[PDB]
Structure 1
Amino acid sequence: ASVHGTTYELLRRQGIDTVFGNPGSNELPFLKDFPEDFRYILALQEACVVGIADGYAQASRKPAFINLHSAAGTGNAMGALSNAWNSHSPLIVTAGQQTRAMIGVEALLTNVDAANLPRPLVKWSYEPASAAEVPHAMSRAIHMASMAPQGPVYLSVPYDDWDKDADPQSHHLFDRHVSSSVRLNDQDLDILVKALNSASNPAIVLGPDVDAANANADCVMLAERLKAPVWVAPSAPRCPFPTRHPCFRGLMPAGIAAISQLLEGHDVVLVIGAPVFRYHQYDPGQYLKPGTRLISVTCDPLEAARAPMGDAIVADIGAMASALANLVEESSRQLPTAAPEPAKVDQDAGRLHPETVFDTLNDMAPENAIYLNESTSTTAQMWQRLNMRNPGSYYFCAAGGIGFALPAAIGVQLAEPERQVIAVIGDGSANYSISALWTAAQYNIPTIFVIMNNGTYGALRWFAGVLEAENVPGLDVPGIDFRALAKGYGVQALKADNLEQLKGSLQEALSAKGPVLIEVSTVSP
């Protein structure tokens, strides 16, 4: 067998059947004779390729395979890799290298010092020392991406390797099963359970690795048994809990002092599947108030090491959440009462308040919709106004890198063909990966894109008002016609300049059989 045949056999035997890519000449020997049982999803720029793959991996809860062109293609994708690192996304990023005979002379398209290029944003990065090693290196990549804590990995392959003969011992790679589905030993787990059973006023904080593990329902059971309020850890990349469950208390503010004040009076705070904590604004104060202790369950040693407070347990979130939910006692405390519904903000017949937009989406979207957020100044309102009952219902760029939601929403919609995906994206953010729209059109992936158009980088302008920072350049983005951009890439486009038009456009988009972009005129901040 050839390295090509052996590698595709390893991929299919490990569950991989889709290649997200933007091709180049170093990759043609890999992509030739593309197997009939695989599919190839083309995107027009590499941030879009990796964003699509990332949404697909996060929603499918399985690795996604990517093929990029040498250094330039890899480089175009590295902002997307920054988000994938923070979301623990299992991405297998491959890139083609020059033929081994011209690597030394640095022919055009040589990826120099290739493994260092995507660092520090990958768990593992490698170029094999010979063609026959390529299947084993690919096996390493698959398992490194997939073991907890999951994350992106990178493999560079000289184009001449694919046609060489494979090692006949590579067959042992095909069916390897590697598990990291582990939980704390019984003695120490019993100590943790007793601590939770004994707490007088416990609180629970959940992060994105809960939703990645599909541990959401177990965490509902845990919160019901402990009769504990549940918050989502700050800067949340995913939604780990039903947002109208009586225990739910919302998204935590991303500040040190704000979080310790919020947790004041809780004697034990159990954090599951989050860093401790993804703060954003600098809000100095106490990490925890006197009387509060924190216990973190994380899948990532790097998270456990850097937490500034609390105990930690490094283990699989699915296994831990299941064990805790089934072991704790039912507290005799009263179940927390549900948060009240948000108020309706006054809305005239002009430009839309973001609150109106989210209320109307919540009114009209199916109960199993999936939302993506890259409307950076409206995140708090979004989290208050969307009832998200089910797992896998929310994605936000985990490293704060905009240009994620537009392509990721296409990958999520590909992963979940029976759940309507609605991406809510600011007019600034929409441009970063605008060309991803073409992939939705070409493959008829029926994502809905709601562009919140207020003409400015609102989140920045706010943080500039915060600091009384005068004379900051570059905050306004006037003069973009998003319906013409959608037409450019073959996507049906609608405009909503007021509420009546918003409702009508959403009704049309929800009935449509392909992707739709709605440009919404929103109020200036």
Structure 2
Amino acid sequence: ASVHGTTYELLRRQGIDTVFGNPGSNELPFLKDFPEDFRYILALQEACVVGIADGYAQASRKPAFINLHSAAGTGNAMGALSNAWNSHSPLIVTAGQQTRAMIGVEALLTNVDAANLPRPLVKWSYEPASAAEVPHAMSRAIHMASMAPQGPVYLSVPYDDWDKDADPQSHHLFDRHVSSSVRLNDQDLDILVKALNSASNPAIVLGPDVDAANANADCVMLAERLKAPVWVAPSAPRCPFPTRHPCFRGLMPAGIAAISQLLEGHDVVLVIGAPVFRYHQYDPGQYLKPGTRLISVTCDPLEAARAPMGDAIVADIGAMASALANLVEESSRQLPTAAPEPAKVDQDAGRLHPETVFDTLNDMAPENAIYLNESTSTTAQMWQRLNMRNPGSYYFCAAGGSGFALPAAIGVQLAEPERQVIAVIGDGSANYSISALWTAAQYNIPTIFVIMNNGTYGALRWFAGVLEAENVPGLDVPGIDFRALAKGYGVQALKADNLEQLKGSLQEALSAKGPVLIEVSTVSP
């Protein structure tokens, strides 16, 4: 067998059947004779390729496979890899290298010092020392991406390797099963359960690894037994809990002092599946107030090590959430009362308040919709106004890098063909990965893109007002016609300048048979 045949056999035996890619010449010997049982999803720029694959991996809860062109293609994808690193996304990034005979002379398209290029944003990065090693290196890539804490990996392959003979012993790779589905030992788990059972006023904080593990329902059971309020850890990349459940208390503010104040009076705070904590604004104060202790369950040693407070347990979130939910006592305390509905903001017949947009989406969207957020100044309102009952209902760029939601919404829609995906993206953010629209058109992936057009980088302008920073350049983005961009890439486009038109556009988009972009005129901040 060839390296090509053996590698595709390994991929299919490990559950991989789709290649997300933007091709180049170093990749042609890999992509030739493409297997009939695989799909290739083309995107027009590599940030788009990786974003699509990332949404697909996060929604599918399985690794996604990517093929990029040498250094330039890898490099164009590194902002997308920064988000994937923070979301623990299991991405297998492969890039073609020059033929081994011209690497030394640094022929055009040689990826020099290849494994160092995507560092520090990958868990493992490698170029094999020989063609026969390629299937084994691919096996390592698959398992490194997939083991907890999941994350992106990188493999560079010289193009001449694919046609070489494989090692006949590579068959031992095909059916390897590697598990990291582990939980704290019985004695120490009993100690933790007793601490939870004994708490007078526990609180629960959940992060994105809960939703990645599909541990959401177990965390609902845990919160109901402990009769505990539940937040979402700050800068949230996913939604780990039903947002109208009576225990739910919303998205935590991303500040040190704000969080310790929020937790004041809670004697034990159990954090599951989050860094402690992804603060953002600088809001100095106490990490925790006197009387509060914190216990973190994380799948990532790096998170456990860097927490500035609390105890930690490094284990699989699915296994731990299930064990805790099934072991804790039912507290005799009263179940927390649900948060009240958000108020309706006054809305005239002109430009839309973001609050109006979210209320209308909540009214019209199916109950199993999936939302993506890259409307950076409206996140708080989004979290208050969308009832997200189900797992896998929310994604936000985990490293804060714009350019994620537009392509990721296409990958999520590919992963979840029966759940309507609605990406809510600011006019600024929409540009970073605008060409991803073409993939939705070409493959007829029926994502709805809602562009919140307020003419400016609103979150930045707000923070500049917050610093009394005058004379900051580059904050306005006038003069972009998003319906024309959509037409450019073959996506149906609608405009909503007021509420009547927003409702009409959403009705038209929800009944369409393909992707739709709606440009919404929103109120300037």
TM superposition score category, shorter chain reference: over 0.9
Report deviation, 1:331. 0.1
Shift of residue 293, structure 1, vs aligned partner: 0.0
Distance 2:91 2:285 in 1: 37
Q: Distance between the aligned counterparts of 1:109 and 1:130, measured in 2?
A: 19
**Per-residue deviation, 1:163:** 0.0
SS in 1 for 2:395: strand
SS in structure 2 opposite 1:503?
Answer: helix
Q: Following TM superposition, by how much is the alpha carbon of 1:474 offset from its aligned partner in structure 2, in angstroms?
A: 0.1
The C-alpha deviation readout for 1:184-238, integer Å capped at 9, x for no partner, is: 0000000000000000000000000000000000000000000000000000000
CA distance in 2, matches of 1:398, 1:130: 36
Deviations 1:433-461 (A, max 9, x none): 00000000000000000000000000000
Q: In the alignment, is residue 228 of structure 1 matched against residue 209 of structure 2?
A: no
Measured against aligned partners, the alpha-carbon deviations of 1:142-161 in whole angstroms (never above 9, x if no partner) come to 00000000000000000000
What is the Cα deviation at residue 57 of structure 1? 0.0
State the Cα deviation string for residues 262-305 of structure 1 (Å, max 9, x = none).
00000000000000000000000000000000000000000000
Tell me how far 1:379 sits from its aligned partner.
Answer: 0.1
Where 1:409 maps in the other structure, the secondary structure is: helix
- In the TM superposition, residue 97 of structure 1 has moved relative to its aligned partner by 0.0
Please state whether the residue corresponding to 1:517 is helix, strand or coil. Answer: strand
Deviation string, structure 1 residues 480-513 (Cα, Å, up to 9, x no partner): 0000000000000000000000000000000000
Determine the structure 2 residue equivalent to 1:254: 254
Partner residue of 1:448? 448
Counterparts of 1:269 and 1:105 in 2: how far apart (Å)?
58
User: 1:391-411, CA deviations, whole angstroms, 9 ceiling, x for partnerless residues?
Assistant: 000000000000000000000
1:369 offset after TM fit, Å?
A: 0.1
| Partner SS state of residue 428, structure 2 | helix
Structure 1 residue 470, shift from structure 2 partner:
0.2
Kindly state the Cα deviation for residue 359 of structure 1 after the two structures are TM-superposed.
0.1
Deviation at 1:314, TM superposition (A): 0.0
Q: Shift in Å at residue 172 of structure 1?
A: 0.0
How far residue 464 of structure 1 moved from its aligned partner, in angstroms, is 0.2
Q: How many residues align?
A: 525
Question: Structure 2: where are the runs of 5+ without partners?
Answer: none
For each residue in 1:25-46, what CA deviation from the matched residue of structure 2 results, as whole angstroms up to 9, or x when unmatched? 0000000000000000000000
Give the TM-score normalised by structure 2: 1.00
Q: In structure 2, what is the Cα distance between the partners aligned to 1:328 and 1:58?
A: 29
Q: Report SS of the residue matched to 2:125.
A: strand
Instruction: State how far apart, in whole Å, the 1-side matches of 2:248 and 2:237 are.
Output: 17
Deviation at 1:422, TM superposition (A): 0.0
Which residue matches 2:512? 512
1:477 is displaced (CA, Å) by 0.1
Once superposed, which parts of structure 1, at least 4 consecutive aligned residues long, lie more than 6 Å away? Answer: none
Q: What is the CA–CA distance in structure 2 between the aligned matches of 1:462 and 1:299, rounded to whole Å?
A: 35
Take 2:35 and 2:511, find their aligned partners in 1: how far apart are those partners? 35
The aligned residue for residue 332 of structure 1 is 332
TM-score, reference length from structure 1 = 1.00
**Structure 2 CA distance for aligned equivalents of residues 282 and 299 of structure 1:** 26
What is the deviation of 1:49?
0.1
1:412 offset after TM fit, Å? 0.1
Hey, what's the Cα distance between the residues in 1 that align with 2:402 and 2:324? 36
Shift of 1:168: 0.1
Q: Matches of 1:29 and 1:459 in 2, distance apart?
A: 45
CA distance in 2 between partners of 1:255 and 1:9 (Å): 48
SS at match of 1:250: strand
d(CA) in 2 for partners of 1:31, 1:10 = 15
CA distance in 2, matches of 1:247, 1:368: 20
Q: How far does residue 105 in structure 1 lie from its aligned partner after superposition?
A: 0.1
In 1, Cα distance between the equivalents of 2:372 and 2:18?
A: 23
Q: How does 1:300-449 map to 2 (within 5 A)?
A: 300-449=300-449
Equivalent residues in 2 for 1:56-455, closer than 5 Å: 56-455=56-455
Identity of aligned residues (%): 100
Query: Deviation digits for residues 366-422 of structure 1, max 9, x if unmatched?
Result: 000000000000000000000000000000000000000000000000000000000
Query: Equivalents in 2 of 1:64, 1:437: separation in Å?
Result: 20
Distance 1:82 1:426 in 2: 20
Give the C-alpha shift of residue 54 in structure 1. 0.0
Shift of 1:318: 0.0
Match of 1:502 in 2: 502
Task: State the alpha-carbon separation in 2 of the partners of residues 190 and 95 from structure 1.
Answer: 47
User: Equivalent residue of 1:495, what SS?
Assistant: strand
Cα-to-partner distance string for 1:88-139 (whole Å, 9 max, x where unaligned): 0000000000000000000000000000000000000000000000000000
Where does the alignment leave 5 or more consecutive residues of structure 1 unmatched?
none
Tell me the CA shift for residue 173 of structure 1. Answer: 0.1
Q: Give the superposition deviation at 1:83.
A: 0.1
